[PDB]
């Protein structure tokens, strides 16, 4: 029917060069019939709970038997990968949900840029205001839109990058989508970023004039 492999930690905190351990719990006894993979297509790391394939470096250490399994990675560096466990003790084969490592780095304020609607979009009857909040740390951040000083919540769509595999920062896009009608009825469009790197928000705005 189903053996459930639970990786309870979706994210695992650590620092560059550290050793770290990822956990995987089986709902039933799977002995040592467990595999570990990494994925940005997956790449095979460990089989039979503790055995490395030919070519997998020894910075990976598999451990466990029965229901409790762990993957240990030493000398962790900046990457864009998660780690998955899998049981093959019985059909159907089942996978864990995955665990991604989060690399520590120095706090960094976002670089905030705001853009008005393009001429092309307005011709079609739409009006999107775009705000980028780029290369900040830690990942927690708040964005607030203001239209002529009044807070605006409807029509906002946000998207977040994963932690960058090279400078360990995060970036965010916020897009406020209005109709051309509503857009032409107001003057000031403001994107406000609240981040732990300052007690005063970073304010970017423009006037439709």
């Amino acid at each position: 029917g189903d053996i459930v492999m639970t990786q309870s930690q979706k994210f695992m905190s650590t620092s560059v060069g550290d050793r770290v351990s990822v956990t995987c719990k089986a709902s039933q006894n799977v002995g040592t019939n467990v595999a570990w993979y990494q994925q940005k297509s997956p790449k095979a790391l460990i089989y039979s709970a503790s055995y490395r394939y030919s070519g997998v470096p020894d910075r990976f250490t598999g451990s466990g038997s029965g229901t409790d399994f762990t993957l240990t990675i030493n000398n962790v560096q900046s990457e864009d990968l998660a780690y998955f466990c899998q049981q093959y003790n019985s059909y159907p084969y089942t996978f864990g949900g995955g665990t991604k490592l989060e690399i520590k780095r120095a706090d960094a304020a976002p670089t905030v840029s705001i853009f008005p609607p393009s001429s092309e979009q307005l011709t079609s009857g739409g009006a999107s205001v775009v705000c980028f909040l780029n290369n900040f740390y830690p990942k927690d951040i708040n964005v607030k839109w203001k239209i002529d000083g009044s807070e605006r919540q409807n029509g906002v769509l946000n998207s977040w990058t994963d932690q960058d595999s090279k400078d360990s920062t995060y970036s965010m896009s916020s897009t406020l989508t209005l109709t051309k009608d509503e857009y032409e009825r107001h003057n000031s469009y403001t994107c406000e970023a609240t981040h732990k790197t300052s007690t005063s928000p970073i304010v970017k705005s423009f006037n439709r004039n």
């Binding site: 084969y93 775009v130 980028f132 780029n134």
Partner: protein, 212 residues
């Protein structure tokens, strides 16, 4: 090197049928179990089916045993998966995998994406995003279906300082944006163009960013 190449995916209508193939190279195909595993983003990996050395004994995920058939031809070194009466829930990237003797997957294919949906293919609208020692430019990609689109800057020669954000689904249309940051003295001096390819609609759009 061990190499697994899955065949063409794409957008198909609910209730249709289609057959995937995976061409295996670089190893003795008949010496290994083979399998299919699929993955929808954010929900993890799901095992579909596997098959023995000579094809005499398949195994299936019982919820899919009603519509899926796994097969292999060890003379052509190819693994197949036949799918019938496809549902939107079958939307995923499908991987072929070489299964070790104990039951793990030591090699995976590049994956191929299947989208089962009655929504119509729609080409993207691409809008330019125009405005210190650095300057940030961007492109807004709105109203396309299905995923994915590929964004590059200056046909890929501009890769540093780019953030292409994950797409967001809004009323069966996707939207994403991409930003690029260059030294202020190099724009508009040295031109910056975003290229947005949408293979599903056989469309590509290039927008050069210029001052307002």
């Amino acid at each position: 090197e061990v190499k697994l190449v899955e065949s063409e995916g794409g957008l198909v209508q609910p209730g249709s049928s289609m057959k995937f193939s995976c061409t295996a190279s670089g190893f003795t195909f008949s010496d290994y179990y083979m399998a299919w595993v699929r993955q929808v983003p954010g929900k993890g990996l799901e095992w579909v089916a596997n098959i023995n050395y000579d094809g005499s004994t398949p195994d299936y995920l019982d919820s899919l045993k009603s519509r899926f058939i796994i097969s292999r031809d060890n003379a052509k070194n190819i693994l197949y998966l036949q799918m019938s009466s496809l549902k939107s829930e079958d939307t995923a990237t499908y991987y072929c995998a070489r299964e070790t003797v104990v039951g793990s997957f030591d090699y995976w294919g590049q994956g191929t994406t299947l989208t089962v949906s009655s929504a119509k293919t729609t080409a993207p609208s691409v809008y330019p995003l125009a405005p210190g020692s650095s300057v940030t430019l961007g492109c807004l990609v709105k109203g396309y279906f299905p995923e994915p689109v590929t964004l590059t800057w200056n046909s890929g020669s501009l890769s540093s300082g780019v953030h292409t954000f994950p797409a967001v689904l809004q009323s069966d249309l996707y939207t994403l944006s991409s930003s690029v940051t260059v030294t202020s003295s190099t724009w508009p001096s040295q031109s910056i163009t975003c290229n947005v390819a949408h293979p599903a609609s056989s469309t590509k759009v290039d927008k050069k960013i210029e001052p307002r």
